[PDB]
Design a protein around this ligand. Structure first.
Ligand SMILES: CC[C@H]1CN2CCc3cc(OC)c(OC)cc3[C@@H]2C[C@@H]1C[C@H]1NCCc2cc(OC)c(OC)cc21
Ligand SMILES: [Mg+2]
Ligand SMILES: [Mg+2]
Ligand SMILES: [Mg+2]
Ligand SMILES: [Mg+2]
Ligand SMILES: [Mg+2]
Ligand SMILES: [Zn+2]
Lengths: 212, 139, 96
RNA sequence: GGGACGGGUGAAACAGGAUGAUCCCGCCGAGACCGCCGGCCGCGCAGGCGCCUGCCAAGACCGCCUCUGUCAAUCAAGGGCGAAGGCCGGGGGCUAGAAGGCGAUCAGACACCACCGUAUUCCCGGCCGUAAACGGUGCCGCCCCGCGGCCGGCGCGCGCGU
C-alpha cells in the first residue's frame, strides 16, 4: 500500500502575476508551476481574488477577480473577471425593522460581454418620525425598483470594460444610485453587491493590450 | 532546494500564500495554497498527531500540526499568508470548532505575517432537507 | 387548565406559518414558536485580537465580525439555560 | 495539485482510501427549495399564502347632497372547497426517508444512537373526504370603565413635521 515518492518541489519554478493599469499596485504576487515535460499553457486561465484595498493602497470591503489570458516575457497578463464584496459587510447591512430591495439586471457591453449586475438597497427612518419601524407602502417600493432600473440602464447602457472597471473602482454608479433613490425616500445603503461575466468572446487580445 | 525552485526574493514585498482552516467538530485541516487555489504547498491534519479519535479536533493536535506545516512552508520559501476560516456549513452547525483559534495563535506565535481574514463557510440562499426527521435526535 | 393566553406562541391573524429546524437537534418547529437570538462576535477571540493586529501587515485594518441568528426549540433552550422556568407572576414579564 | 489517513460518536464499530482518498481549485448534469429582511405586520370563506419579469380576472376597506326601493337573517334536503398521509394512470429520480439490512447499548433491544436504502416526498388528470381541521368558545343584531400599541383610508390645526 504505502510508498514513498520524491519531493515534487525540486522541479518547480515561479512566475509573476500582473494587474491591469487601472490600479496603482500592479504586482499581485507569484505562482508555482512544474517545468515542461507546458507551463505557459498550464498557468493560463487561472483566477486570482485580489482585495481592492491592496490594489489601491473605503476599499477594504471589496475584492476583484482577475484571470490570466496571455503569458509573455515571463509574466502573466490578466483582465477583469468579476467583482464582489466581503461577507462581513453583507451580514452587517441587514437590520431588524427595515425592508430591503434586491434587484438584478443583465447588461451587454460593446466588446461582446454580457454582464449580470446585482444591486441591493435598504430603507431608513425619517429624522422626526413617531414610529420606530421603517416599513413603506408598495408604490414607493415599485418606484424605487423602477428608478434603480432606469439609473442602471442610463449609467451602464453603453460602456466598455475599461470605463466600467474605473467606475466600479471609484464608486460612481453607487453615487448616482444613492442620489436618485434619495429623491424617493430615505435610503440607508445603496451599492452593487457583485458583477458576473456570463459570456465573453473567445479571442480577447486587443482588449488585453489596451488594459495593460 | 535550488534558488530557482523557490519564489524570487525581493525586499519590496514578501511572498503571499493563502491558508485554509477547516474547523470541524470531528477533525481540523490546515491547508496552504498559492493565491489561486490550484497549487498546494503544504497540507496537514489534526488526525496525524493523536491516537484517540475523540481528540482529533482538539487544540493541541491543531497546534502540533500547525508547527509541522510552519516548518514545511518555511522550508519551501513562504513568509506571509491570508486566512480563510470555515466550518462544516451546508445546512449544518455553522459554528467554528475548537482548533481554529489554536491554529491561528500558533501561526501568529510562529513568526508569520498575517494579511486578510474572512469567513468562507458555505451557506445556501436556500437549502435541501437535513437529516434527523421532524422529531430530531431524540437520544 | 390554560397556562398562557398566547398558547405558547405568537400567532395572530393567521392559520399556518412556515417551519424551521432547530440548530441543535434538527427538530421541526413553527417559526412563531421557536426561540431566536441574534449574536455579533469577532472571528478571532479578543484574547489574541491584539496579537493578530500586531502581526498584521495592513495599515488601518479592522477585525471582521460574525453575524448569526440562532434558533432553538423549547426543550433545548431549557436544557442549555437559554430560558428559565419562572414563577406564575414572573411569567407575565416581557422585559429582558 | 499533494501525499496518508478520512468518516462518525458520550466512546466506538460497520461503509471509504497508493485503482491516490479526505483537502484546494475550475468546469459540467439533474432535480428540489425561495434564506438573514420575516414581525402581539398583512391577505384569504376555511384548508393555507414568501425568487425575477409579464399577462389575466377578483376582493374587502375608506370618501360621496350617485342609483333601486325590503330586494333581508338562519337553515334539514341538495351542491362546492377541503392539511398530511393513502389509491388509480402517466412523467421525473436530488435531498430526506416508512419497510428492509447492518454496527453499537442492554440480561434481553427485532427501539432510542451510527451507516445504507425501497415506496413516498415533485408535476399532470382523477379518487378518498378525514386532523388537538383549537380561540377546545355557532351566525345576525343592541348597550357597555379606563389606558395603550400596530395596519389601511379620510378630514382638521399649525411653527409643515411622514
Ligand atoms: C440511545 C443510546 C444509549 C447508548 N449508551 C449506553 C452507554 C452510555 C454510557 C455513558 O456514560 C459515559 C453515556 O454518557 C453520555 C451515554 C451512553 C449511551 C446512552 C444512550 C441512552 C440515551 N437515552 C438515555 C439518556 C441518554 C443521555 C445521554 O447524554 C447526553 C446520551 O448521549 C447521547 C444518550 C442517552
Ligand atoms: Mg433528552
Ligand atoms: Mg397541567
Ligand atoms: Mg392551525
Ligand atoms: Mg399528497
Ligand atoms: Mg369542536
Ligand atoms: Zn438547537
Amino acid at each position: 500500500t504505502q510508498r514513498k515518492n520524491p519531493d515534487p518541489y525540486l522541479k518547480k519554478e515561479w512566475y509573476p502575476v500582473i494587474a491591469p493599469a487601472h490600479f496603482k499596485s500592479r504586482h499581485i504576487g507569484q505562482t508555482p508551476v512544474t517545468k515542461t515535460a507546458v507551463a505557459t499553457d498550464v498557468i493560463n486561465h487561472r483566477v486570482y481574488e485580489v482585495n481592492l484595498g491592496d490594489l489601491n493602497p473605503l476599499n477594504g470591503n471589496t475584492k476583484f477577480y482577475l484571470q490570466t489570458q496571455l503569458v509573455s516575457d515571463g509574466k502573466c497578463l490578466t483582465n477583469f473577471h468579476g467583482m464582489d464584496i466581503t461577507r462581513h459587510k453583507y451580514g452587517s447591512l441587514f437590520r431588524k425593522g427595515c425592508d430591503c430591495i434586491d434587484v438584478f439586471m443583465d447588461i451587454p457591453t460593446t466588446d461582446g460581454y454580457l454582464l449580470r449586475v446585482f444591486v441591493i438597497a435598504f430603507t431608513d427612518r425619517f429624522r422626526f418620525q413617531r414610529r420606530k419601524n421603517c416599513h413603506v407602502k408598495g408604490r414607493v417600493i415599485r418606484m424605487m425598483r423602477a428608478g434603480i432600473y432606469e439609473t442602471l440602464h442610463n449609467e451602464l447602457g453603453k460602456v466598455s470594460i475599461p470605463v466600467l472597471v474605473t467606475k466600479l473602482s471609484n464608486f460612481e454608479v453607487n453615487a448616482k444610485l444613492t442620489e436618485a433613490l434619495q429623491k424617493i425616500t430615505m435610503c440607508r445603503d445603496v451599492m452593487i453587491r457583485r458583477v458576473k461575466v456570463v459570456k465573453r468572446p473567445r479571442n480577447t487580445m486587443e482588449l488585453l493590450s489596451t488594459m495593460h | 532546494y535550488a534558488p530557482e525552485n523557490l519564489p524570487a526574493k525581493n525586499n519590496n514585498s514578501e511572498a503571499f500564500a493563502v491558508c485554509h482552516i477547516y474547523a470541524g467538530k470531528n477533525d481540523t485541516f490546515i491547508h496552504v495554497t498559492d493565491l489561486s487555489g490550484r497549487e498546494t504547498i503544504g497540507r496537514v491534519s489534526g488526525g496525524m498527531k493523536v491516537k484517540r479519535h475523540c481528540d482529533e479536533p482538539s487544540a493541541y493536535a491543531a497546534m502540533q500540526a500547525t508547527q509541522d506545516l510552519i516548518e514545511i512552508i518555511t522550508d519551501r520559501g513562504i513568509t506571509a499568508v491570508h486566512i480563510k476560516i470555515r466550518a462544516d456549513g451546508g445546512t449544518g452547525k455553522r459554528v467554528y470548532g475548537q482548533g481554529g483559534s489554536a491554529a491561528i495563535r500558533a501561526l501568529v506565535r510562529g513568526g508569520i505575517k498575517i494579511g486578510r481574514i474572512e469567513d468562507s463557510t458555505p451557506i445556501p440562499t436556500d437549502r435541501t432537507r437535513h437529516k434527523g426527521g421532524r422529531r430530531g435526535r431524540r437520544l | 387548565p390554560v397556562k398562557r393566553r398566547n398558547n405558547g406562541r405568537s400567532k395572530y391573524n393567521c392559520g399556518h406559518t412556515n417551519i424551521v429546524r432547530c440548530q441543535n437537534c434538527h427538530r421541526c418547529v413553527p417559526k412563531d414558536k421557536v426561540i431566536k437570538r441574534f449574536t455579533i462576535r469577532n472571528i478571532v477571540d479578543n484574547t489574541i485580537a491584539d496579537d493578530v493586529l500586531n502581526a498584521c501587515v495592513i495599515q488601518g485594518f479592522a477585525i471582521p465580525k460574525l453575524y448569526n441568528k440562532v434558533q432553538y426549540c423549547v426543550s433545548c433552550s431549557i436544557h442549555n439555560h437559554i430560558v428559565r422556568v419562572r414563577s406564575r407572576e414572573d411569567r407575565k414579564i416581557r422585559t429582558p
